[PDB]
Protein backbone atom coordinates (compact mmCIF):
# COMPACT_ATOMS: atom_id res chain seq x y z
CA UNK A 1 0.00 0.00 0.00
CA UNK A 2 0.85 3.68 0.33
CA UNK A 3 3.64 4.87 2.64
CA UNK A 4 2.44 5.50 6.17
CA UNK A 5 3.68 9.11 6.31
CA UNK A 6 1.80 10.15 3.15
CA UNK A 7 -1.22 11.08 5.24
CA UNK A 8 0.80 13.63 7.19
CA UNK A 9 2.31 14.75 3.87
CA UNK A 10 -1.16 15.47 2.52
CA UNK A 11 -1.98 17.20 5.79
CA UNK A 12 1.24 19.20 5.61
CA UNK A 13 0.59 19.96 1.95
CA UNK A 14 -3.00 21.02 2.61
CA UNK A 15 -1.84 23.12 5.55
CA UNK A 16 0.46 25.46 3.67
CA UNK A 17 -1.89 25.54 0.69
CA UNK A 18 -4.68 26.98 2.83
CA UNK A 19 -2.27 29.53 4.29
CA UNK A 20 -1.55 30.64 0.73
CA UNK A 21 -5.29 30.99 0.14
CA UNK A 22 -5.33 33.23 3.21
CA UNK A 23 -2.46 35.21 1.69
CA UNK A 24 -4.69 35.63 -1.37
CA UNK A 25 -7.67 36.89 0.64
CA UNK A 26 -5.99 40.30 1.04
CA UNK A 27 -3.82 40.33 -2.08
CA UNK A 28 -4.04 42.77 -5.00
CA UNK A 29 -3.39 41.49 -8.51
CA UNK A 30 -0.68 43.12 -10.63
CA UNK A 31 -1.13 43.11 -14.40
CA UNK A 32 2.52 43.81 -15.22
CA UNK A 33 3.73 41.02 -12.94
CA UNK A 34 1.20 38.75 -14.63
CA UNK A 35 2.71 39.79 -17.97
CA UNK A 36 6.27 38.88 -16.98
CA UNK A 37 5.00 35.66 -15.40
CA UNK A 38 3.20 34.71 -18.62
CA UNK A 39 6.24 35.55 -20.74
CA UNK A 40 8.53 33.46 -18.54
CA UNK A 41 6.01 30.61 -18.58
CA UNK A 42 5.90 30.73 -22.38
CA UNK A 43 9.70 30.77 -22.59
CA UNK A 44 10.14 27.90 -20.12
CA UNK A 45 7.74 25.46 -21.80
CA UNK A 46 9.47 25.93 -25.16
CA UNK A 47 6.50 27.56 -26.89
Amino acid sequence: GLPLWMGTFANLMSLLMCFFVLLLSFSEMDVLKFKQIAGSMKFAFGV
Binding site: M29, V31, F34, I37, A38, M41, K42, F45, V47
Partner: protein
Protein backbone atom coordinates in the same frame (compact mmCIF):
# COMPACT_ATOMS: atom_id res chain seq x y z
CA UNK B 1 -19.81 19.73 -15.04
CA UNK B 2 -19.71 17.67 -18.24
CA UNK B 3 -16.79 17.29 -20.67
CA UNK B 4 -16.39 14.81 -23.51
CA UNK B 5 -12.62 15.36 -23.71
CA UNK B 6 -11.85 14.59 -20.06
CA UNK B 7 -13.92 11.40 -19.91
CA UNK B 8 -12.35 10.48 -23.25
CA UNK B 9 -8.82 10.76 -21.81
CA UNK B 10 -9.78 8.80 -18.69
CA UNK B 11 -11.53 6.01 -20.59
CA UNK B 12 -8.84 5.82 -23.28
CA UNK B 13 -6.01 5.54 -20.78
CA UNK B 14 -7.85 2.96 -18.70
CA UNK B 15 -8.76 0.94 -21.80
CA UNK B 16 -5.20 1.01 -23.14
CA UNK B 17 -3.65 -0.09 -19.85
CA UNK B 18 -6.25 -2.82 -19.29
CA UNK B 19 -5.93 -4.06 -22.89
CA UNK B 20 -2.21 -4.32 -22.23
CA UNK B 21 -2.90 -6.26 -19.02
CA UNK B 22 -5.66 -8.42 -20.56
CA UNK B 23 -6.83 -9.20 -24.09
CA UNK B 24 -9.81 -7.83 -25.98
CA UNK B 25 -11.69 -11.13 -25.80
CA UNK B 26 -11.21 -11.34 -22.03
CA UNK B 27 -12.36 -7.74 -21.64
CA UNK B 28 -15.52 -8.44 -23.63
CA UNK B 29 -16.14 -11.64 -21.66
CA UNK B 30 -15.82 -9.71 -18.40
CA UNK B 31 -18.28 -7.11 -19.69
CA UNK B 32 -20.76 -9.81 -20.71
CA UNK B 33 -20.53 -11.62 -17.37
CA UNK B 34 -20.93 -8.33 -15.48
CA UNK B 35 -24.01 -7.51 -17.55
CA UNK B 36 -25.45 -10.96 -16.89
CA UNK B 37 -24.78 -10.55 -13.16
CA UNK B 38 -26.46 -7.12 -13.08
CA UNK B 39 -29.48 -7.49 -15.36
CA UNK B 40 -30.31 -11.03 -14.19
CA UNK B 41 -31.04 -12.38 -10.72
CA UNK B 42 -29.53 -15.51 -9.20
CA UNK B 43 -32.08 -18.15 -8.25
CA UNK B 44 -32.96 -18.16 -4.56
CA UNK B 45 -31.56 -21.23 -2.75
CA UNK B 46 -34.96 -21.79 -1.11
CA UNK B 47 -36.48 -22.33 -4.56
CA UNK B 48 -33.64 -24.70 -5.48
CA UNK B 49 -34.17 -26.62 -2.23
CA UNK B 50 -37.89 -26.89 -2.97
CA UNK B 51 -37.11 -28.10 -6.49
CA UNK B 52 -34.82 -30.77 -5.03
CA UNK B 53 -37.67 -31.68 -2.65
CA UNK B 54 -39.98 -32.20 -5.63
CA UNK B 55 -37.32 -34.21 -7.48
CA UNK B 56 -36.72 -36.47 -4.47
CA UNK B 57 -40.45 -36.95 -3.90
CA UNK B 58 -40.93 -37.88 -7.57
CA UNK B 59 -37.83 -40.12 -7.46
CA UNK B 60 -35.71 -28.48 -13.93
CA UNK B 61 -34.96 -24.92 -15.03
CA UNK B 62 -31.39 -24.14 -13.96
CA UNK B 63 -28.71 -25.19 -16.43
CA UNK B 64 -26.56 -26.80 -13.73
CA UNK B 65 -29.49 -28.81 -12.38
CA UNK B 66 -30.41 -29.85 -15.93
CA UNK B 67 -26.84 -31.05 -16.50
CA UNK B 68 -26.98 -32.96 -13.21
CA UNK B 69 -30.24 -34.64 -14.22
CA UNK B 70 -28.85 -35.56 -17.64
CA UNK B 71 -25.70 -36.99 -16.05
CA UNK B 72 -27.80 -38.99 -13.58
CA UNK B 73 -30.12 -40.38 -16.27
CA UNK B 74 -27.44 -42.18 -18.29
CA UNK B 75 -26.38 -44.47 -15.42
CA UNK B 76 -23.33 -42.62 -14.09
CA UNK B 77 -21.71 -43.39 -10.75
CA UNK B 78 -21.08 -40.69 -8.16
CA UNK B 79 -17.39 -40.27 -9.04
CA UNK B 80 -17.77 -39.16 -12.67
CA UNK B 81 -20.71 -36.81 -12.05
CA UNK B 82 -18.91 -35.37 -9.02
CA UNK B 83 -15.77 -34.75 -11.08
CA UNK B 84 -17.75 -33.07 -13.87
CA UNK B 85 -19.57 -30.84 -11.38
CA UNK B 86 -16.29 -29.87 -9.69
CA UNK B 87 -14.89 -28.99 -13.11
CA UNK B 88 -17.91 -26.81 -13.92
CA UNK B 89 -17.81 -25.13 -10.49
CA UNK B 90 -14.10 -24.37 -10.86
CA UNK B 91 -14.67 -22.98 -14.35
CA UNK B 92 -17.44 -20.66 -13.12
CA UNK B 93 -15.36 -19.53 -10.14
CA UNK B 94 -12.36 -18.83 -12.38
CA UNK B 95 -14.50 -16.85 -14.84
CA UNK B 96 -15.95 -14.71 -12.05
CA UNK B 97 -12.53 -14.19 -10.45
CA UNK B 98 -11.05 -13.05 -13.77
CA UNK B 99 -13.94 -10.63 -14.31
CA UNK B 100 -13.36 -9.23 -10.83
CA UNK B 101 -9.69 -8.87 -11.72
CA UNK B 102 -10.44 -6.95 -14.92
CA UNK B 103 -12.74 -4.52 -13.15
CA UNK B 104 -10.32 -4.09 -10.24
CA UNK B 105 -7.60 -3.27 -12.78
CA UNK B 106 -9.90 -0.67 -14.33
CA UNK B 107 -10.57 0.78 -10.88
CA UNK B 108 -6.88 1.02 -9.99
CA UNK B 109 -5.97 2.52 -13.38
CA UNK B 110 -8.72 5.16 -13.75
CA UNK B 111 -7.55 7.73 -11.13
CA UNK B 112 -3.95 7.63 -12.38
CA UNK B 113 -5.21 8.51 -15.86
CA UNK B 114 -7.32 11.25 -14.30
CA UNK B 115 -4.23 12.73 -12.66
CA UNK B 116 -2.29 12.46 -15.93
CA UNK B 117 -5.04 14.33 -17.77
CA UNK B 118 -5.22 16.97 -15.04
CA UNK B 119 -1.46 17.56 -15.25
CA UNK B 120 -1.61 17.75 -19.05
CA UNK B 121 -4.41 20.32 -18.86
CA UNK B 122 -2.51 22.39 -16.30
CA UNK B 123 0.61 22.28 -18.49
CA UNK B 124 -1.40 23.44 -21.51
CA UNK B 125 -3.02 26.28 -19.56
CA UNK B 126 0.37 27.43 -18.28
CA UNK B 127 1.78 27.18 -21.82
CA UNK B 128 -0.89 29.53 -23.24
CA UNK B 129 -1.46 32.17 -20.56
CA UNK B 130 -3.35 35.13 -22.06
CA UNK B 131 -6.31 36.26 -19.93
CA UNK B 132 -5.85 36.35 -16.13
CA UNK B 133 -9.61 36.26 -15.56
CA UNK B 134 -9.51 32.85 -17.27
CA UNK B 135 -6.73 31.37 -15.14
CA UNK B 136 -9.34 30.07 -12.71
CA UNK B 137 -12.10 28.55 -14.86
CA UNK B 138 -9.65 26.98 -17.33
CA UNK B 139 -7.95 24.78 -14.75
CA UNK B 140 -11.49 23.86 -13.69
CA UNK B 141 -11.98 21.68 -16.76
CA UNK B 142 -8.57 20.14 -16.05
CA UNK B 143 -9.86 19.06 -12.64
CA UNK B 144 -12.83 17.52 -14.45
CA UNK B 145 -10.40 14.78 -15.45
CA UNK B 146 -9.41 13.90 -11.88
CA UNK B 147 -13.01 13.96 -10.64
CA UNK B 148 -14.04 11.67 -13.49
CA UNK B 149 -11.36 9.16 -12.56
CA UNK B 150 -12.41 9.27 -8.92
CA UNK B 151 -16.02 8.64 -9.91
CA UNK B 152 -15.03 5.79 -12.20
CA UNK B 153 -12.78 4.45 -9.45
CA UNK B 154 -15.50 4.49 -6.78
CA UNK B 155 -18.96 4.51 -8.40
CA UNK B 156 -18.50 2.14 -11.35
CA UNK B 157 -15.50 -0.16 -11.53
CA UNK B 158 -14.88 -1.06 -7.88
CA UNK B 159 -18.64 -1.54 -7.19
CA UNK B 160 -18.90 -3.71 -10.32
CA UNK B 161 -15.99 -5.84 -9.10
CA UNK B 162 -17.64 -6.16 -5.68
CA UNK B 163 -20.94 -7.15 -7.31
CA UNK B 164 -19.12 -9.73 -9.44
CA UNK B 165 -17.50 -11.23 -6.34
CA UNK B 166 -20.88 -11.34 -4.58
CA UNK B 167 -22.51 -12.98 -7.60
CA UNK B 168 -19.63 -15.48 -7.68
CA UNK B 169 -20.37 -16.31 -4.04
CA UNK B 170 -24.07 -16.82 -4.83
CA UNK B 171 -23.34 -18.97 -7.89
CA UNK B 172 -20.85 -21.19 -6.06
CA UNK B 173 -23.28 -21.58 -3.14
CA UNK B 174 -26.09 -22.57 -5.51
CA UNK B 175 -23.77 -24.99 -7.31
CA UNK B 176 -22.66 -26.62 -4.04
CA UNK B 177 -26.32 -26.96 -3.06
CA UNK B 178 -27.11 -28.58 -6.41
CA UNK B 179 -24.12 -30.89 -5.90
CA UNK B 180 -25.47 -31.95 -2.51
CA UNK B 181 -28.95 -32.49 -3.92
CA UNK B 182 -27.62 -34.61 -6.79
CA UNK B 183 -25.53 -36.69 -4.39
CA UNK B 184 -28.58 -37.22 -2.17
CA UNK B 185 -30.67 -38.18 -5.21
CA UNK B 186 -28.13 -40.73 -6.44
CA UNK B 187 -27.81 -42.07 -2.89
CA UNK B 188 -31.58 -42.49 -2.60
CA UNK B 189 -31.74 -40.74 0.77
CA UNK B 190 -34.89 -39.69 2.60
CA UNK B 191 -36.33 -36.28 1.65
CA UNK B 192 -36.51 -34.88 5.20
CA UNK B 193 -32.90 -35.53 6.22
CA UNK B 194 -31.57 -34.00 3.01
CA UNK B 195 -34.08 -31.17 3.49
CA UNK B 196 -32.54 -30.35 6.88
CA UNK B 197 -29.07 -30.73 5.36
CA UNK B 198 -29.89 -28.24 2.59
CA UNK B 199 -31.61 -25.77 4.93
CA UNK B 200 -28.38 -25.87 6.94
CA UNK B 201 -26.89 -23.98 3.95
CA UNK B 202 -29.35 -21.08 4.33
CA UNK B 203 -27.07 -19.63 7.05
CA UNK B 204 -23.94 -19.11 4.96
CA UNK B 205 -21.30 -16.43 5.43
CA UNK B 206 -23.32 -13.56 3.97
CA UNK B 207 -27.04 -14.05 4.75
CA UNK B 208 -27.08 -14.61 8.52
CA UNK B 209 -28.40 -11.08 9.11
CA UNK B 210 -31.85 -11.34 7.53
CA UNK B 211 -32.82 -13.74 10.35
Amino acid sequence: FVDVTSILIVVGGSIFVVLMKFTMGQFFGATKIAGKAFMFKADEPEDLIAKIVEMADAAINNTFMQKGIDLLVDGHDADVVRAALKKDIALTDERHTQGTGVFRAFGDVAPAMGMIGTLVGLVAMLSNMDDPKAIGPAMAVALLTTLYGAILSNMVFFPIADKLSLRRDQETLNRRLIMDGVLAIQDGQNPRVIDSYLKNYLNEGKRALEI
